[model samples]
Structure formats: C-alpha cells, structure tokens
Target: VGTTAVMVAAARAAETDRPDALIRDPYAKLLVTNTGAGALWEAMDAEAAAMVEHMRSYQAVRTNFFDTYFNNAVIDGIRQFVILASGLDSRAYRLDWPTGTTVYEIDQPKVLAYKSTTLAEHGVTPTADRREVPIDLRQDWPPALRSAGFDPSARTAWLAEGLLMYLPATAQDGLFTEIGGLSAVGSRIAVETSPLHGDEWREQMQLRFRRVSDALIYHDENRAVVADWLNRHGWRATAQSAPDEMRRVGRWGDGVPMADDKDAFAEFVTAHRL
Candidate 1:
C-alpha cells in the first residue's frame, strides 16, 4: 500500500537534491531510504526508467504548484489545514505556518505511524500543530478526523494531491461531497485533477507495464472535472493546466506533454468556499 508513497518520496528526494528545487522535503530521502523495499524501488526497464524520469519533472511542477497554493492560503489567514491521503508528504514539517495553525494529516494508520516513527527517530519535528487522522478515505473517516480535533466551524485549507486518480467516479464525488460539508465559509482547497487518457495511450501504458500488472489497480477514467464541481458546490474555483504551470514556474522542458495532449496532463485547481 505504501509502495506508492515510497516511490513519490523518492521523487521528492531527488527533486530536493536539485539546485533549482521547486519544493524541498528534507525528510523525503530518509523516508524512502528507510523503507528498504528493494527491487520494488527499481524501474522495470529502460522505457519505464524514462517514464519515471518524466514523472519526476511532473512531480516537481505539481508539488511546487501546491506549495504555492498553501503558502498563499495561509497568507489569507487560514489557520486550520487538512491534507487528504497524506501518504509520505512532509509539508506539515516543512511549511512555516502562522501562530495557532493546526494541520491535520489523514491517511492509512500504518502509513501515518511509519512516517511519524521514522521522522521522530531522525530527530525531525513538525513546524505546525500536526495531528494524525488514521483511517481509510473509503471508510467513515469524518469521525476519525473530528476525533483528531478538526474544527469545521473554522475556515480550513484542504489539499488533495495525487489522490483523485486512484478513486473511481463515484468515489471521487463522494470525497468532494465530504470535503464540501466539512469546509467553512472562506475555507480554501487545492487539488490535482485526474487525467482522462485516450484509449491508445492507456493501452500503450498497459502493454509497457505488463510486468507490473501483478502490482497495481486503477479505474483510469476522469470522473470529476474539479473546477466545475467546486464552482457548482458553492466555491469559487480556478484551474491551470499542468504544462502551463510548468512554464509559468520556469520548469517546462522537452518531455513535457503538449498542451493539446488533453489527456496527458492533469490540471492544478484551487478554490475558496463561497
């Protein structure tokens, strides 16, 4: 379950080592190295290696976009934060939050425990009031989040990074419905929208990763158009396509999917509760 977490951690670790790193995660390398999931960490072939490299650049852009979103969100005086499917993300430790700010990290119990234990052993501590909501998103997680001291009365800053793709259309809607209910007036949210790849591209990827079929599952449809959903649900939402954001942030490069390749990239969306 956390193998994906380790993989993303590895990408963040690599990005941190870059001279022009868009976002820094000092805990990323430690998290990945300590996982020790040998071979599972390796690319299956040269093609896969290239794919991973492309993903690395995309991750840098994606992370940077969300990083900026959160930074701006706090400046607007949002003090309560929620990171859905927190996985191995270290933002709670890395970001400088305002006084009295509280960040709730939600994820599987094992994943949250592993992150806290590893960071504690490494002498790292969160910069904000970090609380863990240990439960599956597919489960009744609202109670668990409330138990962790979440206050729906206060404006919140929410993040759903790298999450929508893994859930089916119905589940994606369910998740948004939950978030909307919990968000207070003027609360902010940031998300990475899922891509709806063309069948040709999907089939190609399936063929390329046939060896890893024993490894994963995904419902490869683009269920929710994030910006539209938020707009209709009492939020003022705006979106930027990934390539555009990459260019804006000066990270665009040769391998980036063209803007016309609609299915190849996901939009980065941000919104404020109305």
Candidate 2:
C-alpha cells in the first residue's frame, strides 16, 4: 500500500515546517493531506511517539544527504537520474536541475499516480524532465523503465532510499546486479542502508503500529553490505554512518536515534561506477 509513502511525506512536511529544516520539499504537506494520512500522522499516541520522533529526524537527515548527493552529481555533468521505490519523494518537483536533466522515478503505479495528481492539482510542475516507470521493483521493471525513455547509455545518478529493508536478501542482491548492469561508466548511486532491528524491538514496533505492520518486513544485517557489493561489482564505494552524517549536517539533536541504539543506525552509502 501507499501508506508508507504517506508516512515519509508527512515526516518531510514536518521537517519543512521546522525553523531548522534540513531540506525543503514544498509539495510534501499537500501530498500527505491528499493521502488522508495527515490525521494518522498527527494523532500519534504516546506509545508510537518515540518511534515517530526517531523516524522524523532520520527522514530529515536522509533526505538532506540525498539532496546534496543529487546536486553534486549534476555539478559533475550527470544529467540522468533514477529513484528506486521513489515513494512520496518530491525531489523531481523541488530540486533545481540544470537543462537536459531528466529524473526517472520507479515505484508502484498507484503511488506514482497519487503523487503526480496531487502535485499537479496544486499547480506544481517538475523542474526537470520527469518520467515515471510505475512497476513493482520485484517484477521485470527494467524494460518498463527503458520503455519510459530511460537511456541506459547515459551516466545516471541512482538513489535507493527507504527501500532495501522491504526487499528480501536475494532481491537486494538482484537489485544491485540489475543496477550494475544498467549503469554506464561515470554513473553514481546513493543508498540508505536498512536499519537492523532485533526481534523484540521489531515486535514492539509492530505492536505500536499494527495498522501499518504489514509494511514492516524487516531485512536486517542478513543482507549483503551494500558498499562492499558495489565495490566488488565495478564501483568505488564509501559509507558514512547515518549518525555521523546527521552530526556533520548539524541535525544531531532531540528525537534522533540514541547513541547506544546501534540497531537504529544505518549508513548512507555512495558509489561511483568504475
């Protein structure tokens, strides 16, 4: 379902309204309201408040890191972009892309439909040449992507954020393999690693948000390390721990993951195609 997308968009909206906002996604609030999840997001009980708080901060840091990642890629002349499991991310609408830039978002058709329709109704036009490949990631989506006018020969910037954990380990490996095959030399990818949650903690979270529990298929450390896999597959990769990035960007304050909570910490992995 698109509920998770709504949650992320709600978090982004919350951040956008903050005085110390790390990223600006002007369409986020409207998108969340349109999804009817604005009330659910706003009415969090004390039991779910802690989890929500942590996620909101994490979302800000993650969004800020990827925003900078895309901007840097454009400065290096990368014009093509792909966002896997794009969710309610409004980068295509909000980011300032130079001429000739094209952003391809891959996700479920319903999710993409909702976002485009909602934003268009608000008179928001994308700054880049925006294309949507509405297909499930587990299915054969590469053909659909190419059919959407994706040029595999062009050096592209790829983003996989808030996605890996939902996929099984084998699918995660398959995802990297597909990305490696499609990427041209000089391409770059920025990934948000999945947070590892122990069973007890996961069960507690599920109890807290039973309505969205089905969306929480945990894929912890059992998956291959994304940076290492990329390095082995003709990419030069480096990782910055999420906490470190939050601190680097001065977003390491209240409601974030605690210093002792290693399970909540993920990595931001960036790679350049070799």
Predictions in order: lDDT: 0.80, 0.82
Cα misplacement distance, residue 209 of candidate 1 (Å):
8.4
TM-score of 1: 0.87
Instruction: Output the TM-score of candidate 2.
Output: 0.89
lDDT of 2 at 256: 28
Q: Against the true structure, what is each candidate's TM-score?
A: 0.87, 0.89
lDDT score for residue 186 of model 1: 92
User: Tens digit of lDDT per residue, candidate 2, span 177-273?
Assistant: 9888899999999998776653354566556666444334655457788888899999999999887887787766544224457556678999999
Which 10-residue window in model 1 sums to the lowest lDDT?
Answer: 38-47
Deviation in angstroms for 217 in model 2? 2.4
Candidate 2 segments whose C-alpha is farther than 4 A from its true place:
44-52, 197-215, 253-258
